[PDB]
Amino acid sequence: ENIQEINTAISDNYTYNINNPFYILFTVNTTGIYKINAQNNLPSLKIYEAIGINYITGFDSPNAKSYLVVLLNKDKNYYIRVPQTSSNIENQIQFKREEGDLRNLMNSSVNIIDNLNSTGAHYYTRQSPDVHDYISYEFTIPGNFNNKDTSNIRLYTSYNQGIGTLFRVTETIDGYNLINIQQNLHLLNNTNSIRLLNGAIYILKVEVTELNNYNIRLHIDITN
Amino acid sequence: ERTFLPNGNYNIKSIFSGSLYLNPVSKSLTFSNESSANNQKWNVEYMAENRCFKISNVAEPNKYLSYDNFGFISLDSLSNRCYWFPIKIAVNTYIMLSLNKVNELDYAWDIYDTNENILSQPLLLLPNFDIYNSNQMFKLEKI
Amino acid sequence: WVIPPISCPENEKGEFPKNLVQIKSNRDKETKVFYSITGQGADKPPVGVFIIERETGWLKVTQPLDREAIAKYILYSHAVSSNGEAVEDPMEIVITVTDQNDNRPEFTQEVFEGSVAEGAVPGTSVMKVSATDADDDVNTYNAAIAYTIVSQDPELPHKNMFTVNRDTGVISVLTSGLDRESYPTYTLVVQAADLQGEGLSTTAKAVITVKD
Amino acid sequence: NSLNDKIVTISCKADTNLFFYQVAGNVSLFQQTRNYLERWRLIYDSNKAAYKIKSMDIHNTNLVLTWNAPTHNISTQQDSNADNQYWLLLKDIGNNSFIIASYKNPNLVLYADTVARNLKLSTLNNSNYIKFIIEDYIISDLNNFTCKISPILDLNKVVQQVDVTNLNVNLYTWDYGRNQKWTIRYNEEKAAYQFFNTILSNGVLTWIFSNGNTVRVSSSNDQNNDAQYWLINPVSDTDETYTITNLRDTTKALDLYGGQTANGTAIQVFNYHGDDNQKWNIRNPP
Amino acid sequence: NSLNDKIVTISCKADTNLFFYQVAGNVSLFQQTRNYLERWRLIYDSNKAAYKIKSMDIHNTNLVLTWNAPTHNISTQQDSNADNQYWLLLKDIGNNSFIIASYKNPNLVLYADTVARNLKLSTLNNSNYIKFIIEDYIISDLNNFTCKISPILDLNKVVQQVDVTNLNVNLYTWDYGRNQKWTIRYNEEKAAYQFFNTILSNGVLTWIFSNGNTVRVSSSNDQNNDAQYWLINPVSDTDETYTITNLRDTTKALDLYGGQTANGTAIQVFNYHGDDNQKWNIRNPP
Ligand SMILES: [Ca+2]
Ligand SMILES: [Ca+2]
Ligand SMILES: [Ca+2]
């Protein structure tokens, strides 16, 4: 334990500059939804609440890009756990309060999927959230966007059952907008495919409903 | 710090073609063949105080993309009609809304097509409802 | 209860029903929890504006909102197990409607009347025009009116005979030269624009009679 | 002006089988029903130079075609005489079709969604999804309507041809006969109707005038005889009940022999009075 | 369709005094000229469901109304059957005027710039600047035309009522008299014209069939005396020359007795033969 401490209560925006796991203590001025991440979403963070310590969301998976969407209350203390990495380039933790559609993603870790090929099978293994807890996946459909071209996408898991919510994302100067694409996807061994636009960005929210395995394994299979 | 449409020069293309570039022809705006001239280049600047973007022509850096009283996009001196609120729906793909309500609705850039052909069409300002209208989709590409 | 601040912008253009938030009880591991909402906007008039997924807690809005009609909604959420017994006390949830600048400033009158002495000194208050704006006074500048003078008839003996305070709408004499015999009547087109003069605008006439 | 308080049906150029249909406040594109739920009254405003499109639903008498701004959806709301409930009827001469533009915002016009079977607003194009057919409801109901014609005196009996070898017209019991069914067709230039008997490829209900009073079906000589054309006029406070007059001499009407309700009586033209024998139940063949 | 190959004039609803005017490829708005410079032939293309608007210029015969896309400019160019040379003719049933929309871009319609006196474009709105009055050029030229009428034998003589209390009609040298001028008014229902002499307010040109070929001026308090009405048909390959025939009997043309170009010759009807004594110059009086 080498707890570093943020001097004053975070406002809406904040940037905290930084080979061993340490913790960052902070409070927020206004209760609300916060996006917390490193640069650039490396490494993945975990966040805790100081009981008066309880886990909230986030995983510890090496080389895995992600950010946190979490509801922070003004009259509570929170801890960010940053794991050991590699001392090449300096890091920093970014804090932004979100009043928009990101509300649909609390309290979830949002995985950044950045290695999708034209077609084929893809799977991403993370530590599974507890029953009724959330893990999300932000991905871009391969290919150039033309509001016409489309790939077929099969989303499913291997052991744990979960309810999926699929959003399409658009961005303004105010942040993300989330548009409903598909609700109530039963993910365990799901054979249903959905046609999604090439070049479009999507976010899948996964609520674990059956904890059958320590790791949750999201599959993204792409056909023409 | 701003990842959303950073300041600088861009080329503006319609989603219908990758070889037609936006430029002023007479007092109108249309998509034409690549010319490598300053008029097909557009300086995009963020206005922090009004939370929007203004876009000026490089050949005439004092003229901004605006709109007249006839539904046409125009190139004129800076005014609130030059204030755009872009919606990024894909990589470098935007919907360009007027910051202020026009006729009590969201209005956007709109290029008409004849089977995906947009040659000789003027860029217009028309009502917007969603993110699925190809005619209101434009690619802004640095630099 | 795990519920964040909830808000939705007015004039949503479609994609209904839109997801606002997945609310939950952290006692949801103990038994299967069934969710429901009550209050105006839910089960009470206007009914069906907001709905919730009973088994998942997904709170949704079913239609466009209008902040000038209703600025906030007061709902109560209910968490209940299969036998009807509550697992949580009913929780109050306020849903605020975020403002858009969708209301044009409106002058109280099409034409305002005023009178000014022939030899008044610059700085002399003449009359006051006033407009109103229906948008959010508290959180935005969407109702922040800036008054300006657009034109003056006639353009004699100068272009700027008068000036208007952009915050108050009070019109004062700017330059000297008001002659009753030669120019007894003045018509100014005054403008009222929100967003501190950069937003939506409107015009009215200020008719000023010069006298002895 | 000329369409004020006209009751009409509105169908799609993109698919002439789909009509504007009002159900539970919703508006859908539905198959031809020939009832009042597909009938709309055009209410003109002299100041707006625009029209309200009011549904003729008898249980909901104040529902008008409404644009649900800021969405692009179309439905019916209570008539509050608002700008989003007024419309510009623009007639494309040549097609004789209409573009129906919003008075609130003429940039937007009616667009037929043939997949969702509803209406939305769209900007203009050259397609037929924004073109519509506006027809007087009597004409649209009767035109190309293969029907059976019963005198209101007896609804189990039907005006028919004897058979293909006897073109005489008589009254008889109904039994799904090709000689018992008629296809009404409307000629635009003549503004009159023809009753094609379905047992013939081109046999038309005719008042032969070489004979004094005689109703026989006869071959279709085009642009020739006006005794082969008719004018159909509805009866008040009755769903499907009409009166049939001739075009040659409009004083003569289709008549069952007054007042014989028999199974072999003739069908004849007769001077127009209007008793229960000169009125007809024009139903759809079940 | 119904307006294919019709020669029309096109005027503005915003200013009914301004007409589409063409010369040397340029299109502008100008006052009523009653000549080919403001005459347009509407040419319908069945497949495009749109019209070409072709100028009736007698020197360059292949010029059609063209949008110089993507600019705001409208002109007449050589016909190449181009998309920017076709137009949707939309009749606003609400106020009997036309919206002229581009076939290349149905969002854009003709806009009347009444200050610059020319044409530009605009998206659809409720303004009268995008509304146009299309009309048959003969009706447009003759309706409400206060004119002078001269025999082609002598273009210094005029058809006149002798004086205010002499309702006879003879021939006399033109001398600026109110009795020497006529206001032509068109009747839509009768498809005919009347000649109101400008020394009263009900005296029309009429054939006194009670007494042979006598033509006089009489009161028009009887609407339906067909002898009061006339048909004005243009002579082929002429600029302002017409034949004038009565409606009660169309075989009776307005006739100058003889022959004679004398200063008191009788005006009458006579059996139509088509000679120079039955041809008339209708001109704008100085
Ligand atoms: Ca509002
Ligand atoms: Ca405002
Ligand atoms: Ca507002």
CSV table of N, CA and C in Angstrom, one decimal, chain A residues 163 183-184, chain C residues 22-23 34-36 51-60:
chain,number,residue,atom,x,y,z
A,163,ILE,N,-27.5,-11.0,-19.9
A,163,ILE,CA,-28.4,-10.2,-20.7
A,163,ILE,C,-27.7,-9.1,-21.4
A,183,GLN,N,-32.2,-5.3,-27.5
A,183,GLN,CA,-32.3,-5.5,-26.1
A,183,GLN,C,-32.5,-7.0,-25.8
A,184,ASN,N,-32.2,-7.4,-24.6
A,184,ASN,CA,-32.5,-8.7,-24.1
A,184,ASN,C,-31.8,-9.9,-24.9
C,22,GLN,N,-30.5,2.0,-16.2
C,22,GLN,CA,-30.9,0.7,-15.6
C,22,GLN,C,-30.7,0.9,-14.1
C,23,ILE,N,-31.9,1.1,-13.4
C,23,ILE,CA,-31.8,1.2,-12.0
C,23,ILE,C,-31.9,-0.2,-11.3
C,34,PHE,N,-38.6,-7.5,-8.8
C,34,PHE,CA,-39.4,-7.0,-9.8
C,34,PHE,C,-39.6,-5.5,-9.6
C,35,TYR,N,-39.3,-4.7,-10.7
C,35,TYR,CA,-39.3,-3.2,-10.6
C,35,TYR,C,-40.6,-2.6,-11.2
C,36,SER,N,-41.0,-1.4,-10.7
C,36,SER,CA,-42.1,-0.7,-11.2
C,36,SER,C,-42.0,0.8,-10.8
C,51,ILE,N,-41.5,4.5,-18.7
C,51,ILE,CA,-41.7,3.1,-18.4
C,51,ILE,C,-40.5,2.5,-17.9
C,52,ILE,N,-40.7,1.3,-17.2
C,52,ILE,CA,-39.5,0.6,-16.7
C,52,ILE,C,-39.7,-0.9,-17.0
C,53,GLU,N,-38.6,-1.6,-17.4
C,53,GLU,CA,-38.6,-3.0,-17.6
C,53,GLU,C,-38.7,-3.7,-16.2
C,54,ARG,N,-39.7,-4.5,-16.0
C,54,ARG,CA,-40.0,-5.0,-14.7
C,54,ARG,C,-38.9,-5.9,-14.1
C,55,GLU,N,-38.3,-6.7,-15.0
C,55,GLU,CA,-37.3,-7.7,-14.5
C,55,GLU,C,-35.8,-7.2,-14.6
C,56,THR,N,-35.6,-6.2,-15.3
C,56,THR,CA,-34.2,-5.7,-15.5
C,56,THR,C,-33.9,-4.3,-14.9
C,57,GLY,N,-35.0,-3.5,-14.8
C,57,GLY,CA,-34.8,-2.2,-14.2
C,57,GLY,C,-34.5,-1.1,-15.2
C,58,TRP,N,-34.6,-1.4,-16.5
C,58,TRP,CA,-34.3,-0.4,-17.5
C,58,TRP,C,-35.4,0.6,-17.5
C,59,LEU,N,-35.0,1.9,-17.2
C,59,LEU,CA,-36.0,3.0,-17.2
C,59,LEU,C,-35.9,3.7,-18.6
C,60,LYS,N,-37.1,3.9,-19.2
C,60,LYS,CA,-37.1,4.4,-20.6
C,60,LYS,C,-38.1,5.6,-20.7
